[PDB]
Amino acid sequence: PISPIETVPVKLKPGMDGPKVKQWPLTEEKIKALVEICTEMEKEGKISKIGPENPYNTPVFAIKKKDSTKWRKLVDFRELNKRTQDFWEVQLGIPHPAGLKKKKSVTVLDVGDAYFSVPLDEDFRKYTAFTIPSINNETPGIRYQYNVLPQGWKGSPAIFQSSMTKILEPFKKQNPDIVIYQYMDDLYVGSDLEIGQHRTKIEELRQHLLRWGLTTPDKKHQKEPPFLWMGYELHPDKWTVQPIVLPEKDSWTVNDIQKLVGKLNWASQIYPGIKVRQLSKLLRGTKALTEVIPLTEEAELELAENREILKEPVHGVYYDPSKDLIAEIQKQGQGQWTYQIYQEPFKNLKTGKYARMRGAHTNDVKQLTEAVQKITTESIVIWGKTPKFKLPIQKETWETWWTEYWQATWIPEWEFVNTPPLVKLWYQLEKEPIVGAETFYVDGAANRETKLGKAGYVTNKGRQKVVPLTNTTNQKTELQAIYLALQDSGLEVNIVTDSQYALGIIQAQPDKSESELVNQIIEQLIKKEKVYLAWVPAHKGIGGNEQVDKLVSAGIRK
Amino acid sequence: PISPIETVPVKLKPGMDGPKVKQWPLTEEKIKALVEICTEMEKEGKISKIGPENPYNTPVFAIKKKDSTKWRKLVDFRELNKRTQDFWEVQLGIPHPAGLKKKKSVTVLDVGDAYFSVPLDEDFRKYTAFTIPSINNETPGIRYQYNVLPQGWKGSPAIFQSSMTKILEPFKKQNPDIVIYQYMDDLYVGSDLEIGQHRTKIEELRQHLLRWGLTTPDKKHQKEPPFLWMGYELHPDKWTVQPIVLPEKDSWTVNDIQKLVGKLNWASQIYPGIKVRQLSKLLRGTKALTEVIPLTEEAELELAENREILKEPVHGVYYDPSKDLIAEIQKQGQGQWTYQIYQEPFKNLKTGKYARMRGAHTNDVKQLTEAVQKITTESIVIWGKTPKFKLPIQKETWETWWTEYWQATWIPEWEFVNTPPLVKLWY
């Protein structure tokens, strides 16, 4: 029925006008299909006849499926929607199962003919006029306009939710122990009453809605838990992701790898361990959709391993405000981190991962702090507060690093949890030129056009080396130089460079890079007792720039 | 109550439409405070619940007032300000008194409550809409729009200006020496009197306003022996820019001079005209780093000379009111942060440093929030406008904690840097 609800005043974008789209006459097969429907809708108030004074029109269609015994009126509003004002975005935020609080009893209620029960703003009705096409030429023109929320208009979900929320208050004002969640046309009612005293309330609510014209066909609220909503499987005391069936193909198209990674990410919010490192690398293409991106060998062990974890289903629990929130993080591989949030010993609230592809060079600690940050934001959205962290890092390691890092940082309450691998700084640079230690004046340089370069050094003791390199850049050579010095020096060395690039990468104390050169260099530093790096202005002739920068003339010059 | 006043018609800057900014997620504690504050505002007719036909949005936050007595709602009108006030910088602009910086003492008084009594033009309310968020997206969000001039919107002071100038007359006559400047929700009061006389004319002023209606929060360092300096008193005298030191040594090592050739090679961008001609030659050999090599006289002539070209500033001083002020901050050492305000790179209109060492509130984010609020207050005093900061911090960390140590009623424009500065140790 039509509710005595107040109508929300609607309006067209500034300087626009009602649609005037053209509708192709249709098979007289479906012109009778419509008339039957519209006659029943008109009887019920939903629509009304007016076409003389109504200069607008929206196309109307008709579709019937054997998966039914009747027809279906369908109207294409996409032109009216183009000229209808904006509304307060319905809801760009869905709850997350792990943040729902333990309830004793839940009951979803379907509220079907939602929209046709809510009136539409008198002044806007005229812009909804559709026209039913006559048999042949016997066209007097039968046209109707809506008096309620149209099934595909832009403001229907918003105006419906708003109206439903006002209908509910005089009812939740009298029934304080009942909590209600709105979603599309579903009402989920929750409470802490004995299932007996609960079904009585659900009935009162049904009668309340019934007085407002809204029907809850659900007699007794006959909906079935587990509830399946937004890809979730929700039980009365546990939730989980809906079944994840990873296909088994012989050849994978770039599109098949996506849906694959898609599911693997979705499942990661509760299955500990899922890995996406290699199945994700593959998609490094410029123009591809069917490009038979050939599955690699490492990407092959990954897909198998996730299939193994997906083996036995896992469940997570709901939230209890009286307990604490805790999140633990452990290092998975290189660049990958996993974590779980819980209130108790072994029943996770939710799971998750964090990977870092920020260019390529980052520090194990910098990554941990980032992981802590990503979790913190999530907790704030889901539970309204921050968890206590359990982290595989010693208060000393951490403090040494933040105290010396150029960026300001923060991390809530956290405790150490000894669990390998353990986060730590594999090497520290000295802050003062070492005395007695040899001094290497390092230099490198490549020819951009030819890709031929050289790396070298000259020490104070007269030691010299120059090695020719092919297929290189001014940055590989600049690091090759530092690498040669580290290779020919004793356990304590003083190195001088002109390169701000190389000084930065190393000062950042990286550990397991996506470059074997930097890994070769890292492996050296760790082996050294004391290393001290220093930087001086590139092309402004210094000792290093005059001696170490002239031996590079055994190729290209100027 | 029922105090009718014709409303000043406010209009958006043509072409532009109302704001639609996303509301950051808030903690339950802060949400509870917002709904309590907001419910009172609604009984008093200050704000009204709105429907879905209003698509606009402006972020809201909750911050603690002085001493942490109780919560305060802070509306982030940066976007709305940019869509309006930029042309309420023209139509109802408020002139900036160039002598406020010369005063010996400046107090800052919160005069924001005044606004809540002047009704806002009805066709503009719509644009002030804000949403108190819901935890975990369980409920829609409570939605309101303002019925009266709001507090952090630059049009409020532009409109109350009339009432202000009037209320203040009797006092500007009895006190022609004292400079008074209004910025957003604050009154900036400056004089050259003694800190004991000044603090006296300030509460004289407080009572004059109160005598006429407006209110203003009280101190704590006079009657109840409150361990705190909460009532802002600045002294634009001690303000100076000389963090550019050169190491004064007796034993010059190769390392030492190398660094010096470096700092001097950077300084060379700010002050065209200082070169390392002679120093960049005593380093022409490939010697051990730690090998003393006490400068040749020619060098000492270049070092001595440079030690000076610094204290003598560049042209630079060209404050173009048509440009924006940019502020960069660099985490220095332990509890120390340097900063530079400019409009064109390497042409500093001002430089400084800030410090309250990591011990009591040994937090990084807390210091950064403090330095951002000090650098801003200074800019309001000297140029009558706030700067856009380049904060060395991760965006999300900052968006999560800024509002935990924030004590000011305005919010500056900001952005984040991810690349280390090699402008770090050079001051």
Ligand SMILES: Cc1cccc2c1nc(-c1c(F)cccc1F)n2Cc1c(F)cccc1F
């Ligand atoms: C413990 C529990 C398990 C399964 C579904 C549940 C649930 N609690 C609510 C709930 C709520 F948390 C607040 C108000 C009314 C409620 F019914 N819903 C319903 C529900 C949601 F609240 C969100 C998404 C799906 C859903 F089924």
